[PDB]
């Protein structure tokens, strides 16, 4: 439905998904192809 | 927490005559009624 972009469906997966994978039957190791979200601090050296 | 997310472990038994397999039946009906994001399941002497 187009609501979630790339970062948003990474952040999900992340968040919810990928501990649980992690702790299932039989998996040795989880690779999550993207990133969970962090609080960013984009800083500006003009007005620093 | 119970599997790495917010939890809240409930006790109970089946009352005289009626099993412990129904009785968990009707939990696990109840538990589908509850509002969105509100999931559940067995531990301890109920997983086994």
């Given at each position: 439905?187009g609501?979630?972009?790339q970062e948003?469906?990474s952040?999900?997966?992340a968040?919810?998904?990928?501990?649980?994978?992690?702790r299932?039957?039989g998996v040795?190791?989880?690779?999550?192809?993207?990133?969970?979200?962090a609080?960013?601090?984009?800083?500006?050296?003009?007005?620093? | 927490?119970?599997?790495?997310?917010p939890?809240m472990?409930i006790?109970?038994?089946?009352?005289?005559?009626?099993?412990?397999?129904?009785?968990?039946?009707?939990?696990?009906?109840?538990?589908?009624?509850?509002?969105?994001g509100?999931?559940?399941?067995?531990?301890?002497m109920s997983?086994?």
């Amino acid at each position: 439905d187009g609501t979630m972009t790339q970062e948003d469906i990474s952040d999900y997966v992340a968040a919810n998904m990928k501990d649980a994978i992690s702790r299932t039957s039989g998996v040795g190791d989880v690779q999550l192809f993207g990133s969970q979200y962090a609080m960013r601090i984009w800083m500006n050296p003009n007005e620093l | 927490r119970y599997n790495g997310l917010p939890s809240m472990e409930i006790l109970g038994q089946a009352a005289p005559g009626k099993s412990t397999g129904e009785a968990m039946e009707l939990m696990e009906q109840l538990a589908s009624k509850l509002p969105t994001g509100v999931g559940y399941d067995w531990t301890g002497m109920s997983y086994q």
